[model samples]
Structures are given as C-alpha cells and as structure tokens.
Target: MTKALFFDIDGTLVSFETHRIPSSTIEALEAAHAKGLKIFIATGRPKAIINNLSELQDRNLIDGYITMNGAYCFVGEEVIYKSAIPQEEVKAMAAFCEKKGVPCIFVEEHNISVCQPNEMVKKIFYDFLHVNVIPTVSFEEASNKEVIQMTPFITEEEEKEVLPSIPTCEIGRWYPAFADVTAKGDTKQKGIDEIIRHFGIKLEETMSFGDGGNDISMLRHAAIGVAMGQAKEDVKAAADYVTAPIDEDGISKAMKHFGII
Candidate 1:
C-alpha cells in the first residue's frame, strides 16, 4: 500500500490558466489525508511564492514541501534538508546576467531578488504565474548571500553558453524563457529520499504525480508515478502511468484507478 504521495505544483496540482486548484484535487487530498497517507509538495517554486496556492494554504492540506527543486525541504516546523549554490558560482551567474542584460531572480530562504526588473519580467511573473515580484539590490550584492536557486530569464541558446560558466549548477525548464537553476546533483528525488527515511516508508509504498521536465527524476524514483495527460511526451515516457488532463479531474481519477482513495 502507498504510504506517501508527492505532487508537483503548477501542472499537476493547479491549472496554468486558472491558477487555482481543481475541486477534484481538493477531494483527492482530503481522501488521502483520511487514509493516513503523507502528502508532500515537490515543486520548483520557493516557499515565499507558494503562498499563492490558496487551496493548499487555506486548507492546510499538505504535510511538507520540497521547494526550489529540492534546494529546500521541510516538514511542518522542522526543515529536513537544505542546500545552496556556491557563492562563486552565484557570482559567475550574476556577472553573466549583468553583461547579457538578461533578467534573473535569486531566491534565498527569506526573500526573492530580481535583476533589472522591467515590464517583460513583471508580466512573466505577475501576469503569467500570478506571483509578486519585488526588486532587490543588484546581483553583485545578492551573490554574497546564500542563494538556494537562480532563475535567469534566458533562452536555450543563451543557456548553452551561460550554463557552462557555472559548472556546479544544473538547469530544469518548464518555460521557454527561463529555467530553474539549482546546485548540480540536487533533485526532487533527493528530498523524497529524506522524506521516506524520516517516515520509515519503503520506496515500494510511494507514489508521485507530475507533468514537467523537472518531474522526470521524481517520477522514476517512485514506485508508481502518474503523469498527467497534458504532460510533455518525455515526461509521460518517464511515468509508470498516464491519467487524464488536470482539468478533467485527473488527480481524483488516478486515485480511484489505484484505489488510493
């Protein structure tokens, strides 16, 4: 029997267009909790920005979070694990973005800092993702701080040249304009490993749901991984099963398919 379930935030739990959790998802979460299953969020979002998830926030539905693509992991009041990019690597990224006139966001434990904030950057975060953007000091200043994740708004071609400069980092992209940069070797599965160990849950008793390129590793790590029908072909290929699209009551239907509810 599955003792834990991991959910990816944007496409798996909430709709990109509506920016809200589906009603069926509420039911699925309630059912999982009633069955005493531990439900955790595994997302590229940071803790500060995740407050926009009113469904999970208002209901207190989840048990923990694997945030910043596993840069930070926490359960209730206790953090399970945490990691940050090397300051020198962060400095390199900052210098590159400054030179290229590209916009970037640096996420730390407490706040999010943006570089060269402008209308395009504002629209991407506020309009597209429905998240707030607050401009902080220059990248040079922020680089001195402990950075958990860096989101540089650059295309694939720019990434080709930029990523090599910071060899200690890796990139995961769900959007074409920007990619999530975390320390090399850090993944959502790394956080899942800690969660399972903490709860004494076997890997065979775990399930995960996701619909992004970033979700591939976590999908492979779970005993039963369910990909949303709307997921990319590569993401679907990595999953054990594929369910209906998120708008079609996917989470609830998948629960029923596995008799999870």
Candidate 2:
C-alpha cells in the first residue's frame, strides 16, 4: 500500500561510475508511476543543479523535491517547507572558508554558488555529481544571501577549523571529500515529515531508497526502506532490505522483490 517513494540521487538512482540512471531503473519507475504512485527526489542537491533527472522531469515522473538535504522541499512553484541557515552563521563560515582558500558551495533558496572550483570541487560538481555551473553566483554574494546549506571540501584537519566556526549548523557527509552543513534539525527525516503533512499521506504508506549515507534519515523513517547492496554496514542495517547495486538495476529489483512494480 505504498503511496510514495523517496529516492536518493547519488549511488541510488544514478551510478557514480556512469553518472546516469540505469534504463532498468527508469522503466521500473515508469511502472510504479503508472500505478498512480508518487515519486520524489530526496537528495543533498539543490533545485538549481539537479541535472541528472532531466529525463524524469521531461516525462513528468517526479512528484516533489527534497533538496539540499531537506532544507528545501517543494512541488512545482508551491513550497511545502523551507529553512535557511542563520545569516550570521553563513557570514562567519563564508568569511573563514574564503580566507582559508577552502572550497565551499553555499545554497540559497533560489540559486547555489561555489567558491573558485578547485580540482576536487570540479570533480565533485562537474564530473562526479554532474551539476551545471549556470546557477552559480559569487561566493561573496551568495554567502550574504539567505543560505540554506553549505558544503565545504575539507579534510579532517580543516574540519577542525570550519565546523567549529559554524556551531549553529550540523554536518553530514555522504562523501569523504566534503560534508554538507545546514541549520540544526534540517534533515531528510524532517523533509519526509513536511511532505507527508502537506500531502496528507500516511507515514506507513511510504517507502525510501538510498545508499551508504550517514545523513539518510529518510531511510530510517520510511515504513519500508531499501538500501543498495553496496551500502555501508551501518546503512544496510538501517534498511528493511538490501537490493542490488545501482548498475545492477538495484532499484527495479527491489520493486520486483517487494512486488511494487
């Protein structure tokens, strides 16, 4: 009786190797959509740069968006819920990262910006995440705006400096190269709560798909959670079942295993 399905973009819908959603995954989602089920993208990405889902978007397969790790959740022009980091906190973190020459991406309600793209930053955005740079503004300008999420590419040592400065923001890392920072209590779990409230959907009639992500509260909150087979041990334990890898048509297989398709 699942009415909705939440999907993580990276390592779930799209493969890190190919940076594209597998054809089988697309077909499975089509089957589910034909059943009048709602599908949503729940990821750390922002609206400005969710580039990989153009195929789904064009076909009208997606129902809603939970972007920036739940800081912004919306359906079309109507926002279900939205939150931003405090201005003072954004200023402090931006100034420090700028001075230190550490790359940071600041996400605002309308657009997202990054510090000068380094090799790691390019790989993270242009190559790995396959994001477009068209929405990027200057770090100096975006930091002063109402910010919702900030991702700083830093090492363990650099985190000692950056993380402690933004005390009002919490950190979650799905990637080792950088960690996402957002206002306290902003999480994927919170996103699901808002979506459920807005849509009046029962929490028990929801399912989620994600990866070995430490910030995956949606997985835990979901009535039926399916983790990728290659997920971390802790993440796998958090899920109700484990499916094949993304390239191996993990999501479609999960749909068949659960008889959702």
| Collision count for each candidate, in order | 0, 0
Q: How well does model 1 score by local distance difference test?
A: 0.87
Put down candidate 1 lDDT per residue, 59-162, tens digits, no spaces.
87888889988889999889988889988889988999899998889998988899887677878778888687666679778778799999989888898889
In model 2, the clashing pairs are none
The runs of at least 3 residues in candidate 2 whose Cα sits more than 4 Å from the true structure, single-residue gaps closed, are: 134-140
How far residue 210's Cα lies from its native spot in candidate 2, in Å, is 0.6
- lDDT top scorer: 1
Computed on alpha carbons, the lDDT of every model, listed in order, comes to: 0.87, 0.84
Residue 194 displacement (Å), model 1 = 1.5
Give lDDT tens digits, candidate 2, residues 130-173.
66663455677867788889888877688787766788776777
- CA RMSD of all predictions: 1.2, 1.9
**TM-score for each of the candidates:** 0.96, 0.92
